[PDB]
Design a protein around this motif. Sequence first.
Motif, PDB file in Angstrom:
ATOM      1  N   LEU A   1     -12.416  59.059  95.362  1.00 43.22           N
ATOM      2  CA  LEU A   1     -13.311  58.387  94.642  1.00 43.22           C
ATOM      3  C   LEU A   1     -12.026  57.019  94.350  1.00 43.22           C
ATOM      4  CD1 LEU A   1     -14.094  57.506  91.715  1.00 43.22           C
ATOM      5  CD2 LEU A   1     -11.603  58.411  90.553  1.00 43.22           C
TER       6      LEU A   1
ATOM      7  N   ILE B   1     -15.005  54.438  95.415  1.00 38.22           N
ATOM      8  CA  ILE B   1     -14.724  52.185  94.846  1.00 38.22           C
ATOM      9  C   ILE B   1     -14.390  51.041  95.283  1.00 38.22           C
ATOM     10  CG2 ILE B   1     -13.203  51.245  92.747  1.00 38.22           C
ATOM     11  CD1 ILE B   1     -12.762  53.968  91.786  1.00 38.22           C
TER      12      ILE B   1
ATOM     13  N   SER C   1      -6.702  63.794  85.885  1.00 37.03           N
ATOM     14  CA  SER C   1      -7.201  62.292  85.444  1.00 37.03           C
ATOM     15  C   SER C   1      -7.371  61.718  86.391  1.00 37.03           C
ATOM     16  CB  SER C   1      -6.369  61.519  84.354  1.00 37.03           C
ATOM     17  OG  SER C   1      -6.420  60.054  84.153  1.00 37.03           O
ATOM     18  N   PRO C   2      -8.518  60.583  86.394  1.00 33.50           N
ATOM     19  CA  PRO C   2      -8.568  59.571  87.561  1.00 33.50           C
ATOM     20  C   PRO C   2      -8.094  58.638  87.415  1.00 33.50           C
ATOM     21  CG  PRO C   2     -10.560  59.864  86.148  1.00 33.50           C
ATOM     22  CD  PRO C   2     -10.461  60.780  85.725  1.00 33.50           C
ATOM     23  N   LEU C   3      -8.399  57.535  88.397  1.00 32.02           N
ATOM     24  CA  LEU C   3      -7.101  56.816  89.365  1.00 32.02           C
ATOM     25  C   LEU C   3      -8.270  55.526  88.892  1.00 32.02           C
ATOM     26  CD1 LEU C   3      -3.906  57.474  90.748  1.00 32.02           C
ATOM     27  CD2 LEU C   3      -4.178  57.556  88.652  1.00 32.02           C
ATOM     28  N   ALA C   4      -7.120  54.504  88.609  1.00 32.03           N
ATOM     29  CA  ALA C   4      -9.037  53.327  88.890  1.00 32.03           C
ATOM     30  C   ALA C   4      -8.069  51.943  89.293  1.00 32.03           C
ATOM     31  CB  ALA C   4      -9.950  53.100  87.914  1.00 32.03           C
ATOM     32  N   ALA C   5      -7.312  51.887  88.780  1.00 30.69           N
ATOM     33  CA  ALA C   5      -6.010  50.584  88.610  1.00 30.69           C
ATOM     34  C   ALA C   5      -6.265  50.501  89.872  1.00 30.69           C
ATOM     35  CB  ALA C   5      -5.205  51.075  88.469  1.00 30.69           C
ATOM     36  N   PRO C   6      -6.080  48.589  90.576  1.00 32.58           N
ATOM     37  CA  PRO C   6      -5.449  48.244  91.980  1.00 32.58           C
ATOM     38  C   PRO C   6      -5.144  49.158  92.651  1.00 32.58           C
ATOM     39  CG  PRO C   6      -6.684  46.836  90.065  1.00 32.58           C
ATOM     40  CD  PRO C   6      -6.208  47.735  89.435  1.00 32.58           C
ATOM     41  N   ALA C   7      -3.540  49.104  92.340  1.00 33.96           N
ATOM     42  CA  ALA C   7      -2.171  49.427  92.916  1.00 33.96           C
ATOM     43  C   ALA C   7      -2.545  50.775  93.873  1.00 33.96           C
ATOM     44  CB  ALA C   7      -1.189  49.376  92.462  1.00 33.96           C
ATOM     45  N   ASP C   8      -4.343  52.113  92.565  1.00 36.77           N
ATOM     46  CA  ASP C   8      -3.869  52.712  92.704  1.00 36.77           C
ATOM     47  C   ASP C   8      -4.777  53.325  93.792  1.00 36.77           C
ATOM     48  OD1 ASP C   8      -2.265  54.019  90.918  1.00 36.77           O
ATOM     49  OD2 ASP C   8      -3.828  54.360  88.968  1.00 36.77           O
ATOM     50  N   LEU C   9      -6.203  52.523  93.576  1.00 37.41           N
ATOM     51  CA  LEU C   9      -6.644  52.298  94.631  1.00 37.41           C
ATOM     52  C   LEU C   9      -6.414  51.987  95.939  1.00 37.41           C
ATOM     53  CD1 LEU C   9      -9.692  49.701  92.841  1.00 37.41           C
ATOM     54  CD2 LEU C   9      -9.458  51.991  93.359  1.00 37.41           C
TER      55      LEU C   9
ATOM     56  N   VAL D   1      -9.540  46.860 101.699  1.00 36.44           N
ATOM     57  CA  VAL D   1     -10.514  45.922 101.176  1.00 36.44           C
ATOM     58  C   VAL D   1     -10.184  44.725 101.989  1.00 36.44           C
ATOM     59  CG1 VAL D   1     -11.691  44.200  99.591  1.00 36.44           C
ATOM     60  CG2 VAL D   1     -11.672  46.940  98.744  1.00 36.44           C
TER      61      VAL D   1
END
Lengths: 176, 176, 176, 176, 176, 176
Positions: free
Chosen positions: D38, D42, D91-99, D107
């Motif tokens: 995931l 992203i 629970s999926p993470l999506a916060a910049p720090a998790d990414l 990136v």
Amino acid sequence: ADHADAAHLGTVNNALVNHHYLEEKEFQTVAETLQRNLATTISLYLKFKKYHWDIRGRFFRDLHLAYDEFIAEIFPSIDEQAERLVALGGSPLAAPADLARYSTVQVPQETVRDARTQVADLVQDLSRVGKGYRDDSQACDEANDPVTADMYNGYAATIDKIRWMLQAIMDDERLD
Amino acid sequence: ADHADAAHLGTVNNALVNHHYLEEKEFQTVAETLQRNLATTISLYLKFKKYHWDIRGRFFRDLHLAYDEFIAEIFPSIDEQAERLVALGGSPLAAPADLARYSTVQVPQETVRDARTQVADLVQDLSRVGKGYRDDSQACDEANDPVTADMYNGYAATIDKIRWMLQAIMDDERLD
Amino acid sequence: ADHADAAHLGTVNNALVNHHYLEEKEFQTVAETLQRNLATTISLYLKFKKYHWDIRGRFFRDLHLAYDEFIAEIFPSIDEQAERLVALGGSPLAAPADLARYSTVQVPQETVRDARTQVADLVQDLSRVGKGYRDDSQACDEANDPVTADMYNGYAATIDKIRWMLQAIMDDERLD
Amino acid sequence: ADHADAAHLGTVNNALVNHHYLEEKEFQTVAETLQRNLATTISLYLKFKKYHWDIRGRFFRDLHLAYDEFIAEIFPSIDEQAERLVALGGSPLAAPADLARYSTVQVPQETVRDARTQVADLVQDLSRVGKGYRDDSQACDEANDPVTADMYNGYAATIDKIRWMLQAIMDDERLD
Amino acid sequence: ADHADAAHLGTVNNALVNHHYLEEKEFQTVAETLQRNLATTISLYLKFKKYHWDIRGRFFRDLHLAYDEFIAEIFPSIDEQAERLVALGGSPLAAPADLARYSTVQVPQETVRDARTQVADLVQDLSRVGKGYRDDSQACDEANDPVTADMYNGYAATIDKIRWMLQAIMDDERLD
Amino acid sequence: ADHADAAHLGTVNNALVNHHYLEEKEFQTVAETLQRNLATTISLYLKFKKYHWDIRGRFFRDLHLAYDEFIAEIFPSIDEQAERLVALGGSPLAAPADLARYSTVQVPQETVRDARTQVADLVQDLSRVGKGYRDDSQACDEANDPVTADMYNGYAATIDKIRWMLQAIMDDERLD
Ligand SMILES: [Co+2]
Ligand SMILES: [Co+2]
Ligand SMILES: [Co+2]
Ligand SMILES: [Co+2]
Ligand SMILES: [Co+2]
Ligand SMILES: [Co+2]
Ligand SMILES: [Co+2]
Ligand SMILES: [Co+2]
Ligand SMILES: [Co+2]
Ligand SMILES: [Co+2]
Ligand SMILES: [Co+2]
Ligand SMILES: [Co+2]
Ligand SMILES: [Co+2]
Ligand SMILES: [Co+2]
Ligand SMILES: [Co+2]
Ligand SMILES: [Co+2]
Ligand SMILES: [Co+2]
Ligand SMILES: [Co+2]
Ligand SMILES: [Co+2]
């Protein structure tokens, strides 16, 4: 009821207007229902919109979206009923004052936040409107106008359907 | 102008309502224009429809179809202006009596058959409405609301365009 | 704020880059708002998604679907704001660390199940973002960039609209 | 790897969460791959965008457009992988720090103008991601989750395809 | 600049023409920009087409397709700007000789095969046109015409965007 | 007629240009018709637009809309004729001065309000253009180019059709 008849204006570009295959009294019967239902439909549109815009609370999405769905269902009937009246030698009213006088539905002037309030208000309107179309369909047919009657049968099915959904939503003691 | 403000009702489900980034007086300025324009747009829809339904004569097709085209152009602005008012802590009116009071456009109650008559009537309305949006755009911007102002710039361009077409149609001595 | 300027890299394929019709300081003003808003929009997308995925309870459908609707509304602005910055001789950031630094919106790292919690969180974000675009629009215009300013007026209207819906949903004591 | 498990939060509205037909260790295996992929997807979206926005030179059109095509291909997998994790009690993470932490793709924070540079960077990422999905598909199947495995087979085919096109583009000594 | 004014022709079917809500001098200011931009847009269409048809070399596909994309973006503005002028009591010119006189863009009469040549030519045009719309937007607003100004803000964003892409393409020493 | 030939420029990226399966004189015959018709079509587009924008009077809707319909019918032929010329080793002109020289149709520089005037003007143009395509089709076929000839047969049918409608409209003594 006679304020909708436009076959006897004697004014310019009105010489050919007549009531097609309907007798004078038959047109009177049909035109009454057409003008009344026209005002009502437009008023329902405005009312659904008003509640659409003023609703707040945890059921905002449910009602805000449902109201637009309901509007989409009845909107086409505005032009259809008005032109049906016209095709029979009548003139449809659309001015605010005419809407207020002939509509069986009153548009709120106050800001209604409460969900049960909007719904119960709408449900009573729809029971009235739904039965209205059922009764008007029979009246038109008797008046020898199976065509308009047919239009009402369709409208009726739509109102009755919307009535059901809103009534179902408010049939809940936890609502409030 | 204050009958559109819904941030101080003190009623249920209204506790969070406020005027977002606008000061109290700024909202007063903007809301006045929003409610006025809302009533006007809805009234234009009804008026275009009325003439749409009542027109007769050799220019029936021209005006009957043009009116629907014009309606399609302004209709979206009804919901847009009403919800813009709402997003600013206001409550949009939509009841016939409210339409009659705040609209700068009056919907006919009589059956107008004559083409020049409908057109000239509409042209005067549009000059008024078009300039109305131009002036309201400047007012909103001064009131620190470039957002609503932006909405008006778009609406204005549409009204001005419709104004041109109708004025062009009636600029003819052979019309009548 | 200067980490977005790409007209002075002196690197390969960068010789022609400049700030078009904007002076150096004007670009500095505009680019600050563009990079900040870019990070914010992307972060809102991620945040709406996170809550979209983690919400549970009887209001699951309402919020899960509403979040996607809101995303669809703001998503296009991601590419639009980034390329607007580029067209002005800037370089848009998109890396997680850049998002975290310039965004005015923080994406949750915890699993939020509670509806009021997500909503109130989002509502505060939107009040901030909405006013942000209003203020940035005025700043850009003063900086002689009515073009970007125009873009912000549109974005603002969308944020303000979403703000209203979410605030309305949580304005309820029975929510929890 | 356990920061993705949401079946034991003991928090409100989380009582029913469980790992469906998967045992605890099987979920651990699958969830690791889901959260990792995931973050990676992203991040690929953001990376493709960054290069999309920063590319310059005679191959601007080729890469600028290709990147958007590639994004369109992988974007749907963002929601699909996140909700697959959710359907399994995660629970999926999506916060910049998790990414940043879980993504196998970084990136860029710098402005890369050079085409070969972007491409070679992307090609290495894709070889890694493509093989990643192949390996994760086998792992999930062994973990008794042919369903997620199936999802990965599809994603893999897409990554491998994109990998080919970009590798082909850079396999040229005249590129630079 | 006055050759665009059609409110004083005194000819048949021109009796109602006027400058709506704009004063005489304000119309003069706005009409100058409208007629100039109209000629320019049409000329850009023709120019993009000419290069579209004459380009040859290894970058044929890139530029041939890009030119059509750019045309699709600006084409709608031809009718929009012309009718905006009309709605303000003006008459848009479209004859070759009028295009040549008022356009800030010259269409080539020679067959340009070389890519850098077409691009650099176009880039200079766009810098000029883009700034042109920015300046005309401010002028119109000052002239009390936020409506036209709004139209220009949109056009400007499109020109600036196209400018960026073409400039990026030619920012390459290996191009030739 | 030879200003359209681009197979002998001796310039860069022009080495492979030739007249495909046509002899030198055959290309001369075909290219003359192609460049002439190209200028004419573009000029018809501009002319239809000019009258489209300037028409006033009770027949505004009829002609304003008809002109756009006619434009939609002939527009595709602009690119088709130009690229047909290109495929035969020619270079299409598009500059205002080239349009003026080769077009058999002149675009008005004056504001024509009168309907009969626009129509009669257009009808004469179309009789000329329609016969033009008929004659050019025969010429091309004789010149051993049944392909271009085929294109002209289609264009001809469209012009002849438009000619009929406009002629029919003006065949009325009450028009004026
Ligand atoms: Co009667
Ligand atoms: Co619900
Ligand atoms: Co109708
Ligand atoms: Co039936
Ligand atoms: Co207040
Ligand atoms: Co007509
Ligand atoms: Co709405
Ligand atoms: Co705007
Ligand atoms: Co700089
Ligand atoms: Co893009
Ligand atoms: Co677990
Ligand atoms: Co989803
Ligand atoms: Co499969
Ligand atoms: Co004047
Ligand atoms: Co290429
Ligand atoms: Co037009
Ligand atoms: Co030759
Ligand atoms: Co082409
Ligand atoms: Co054929």
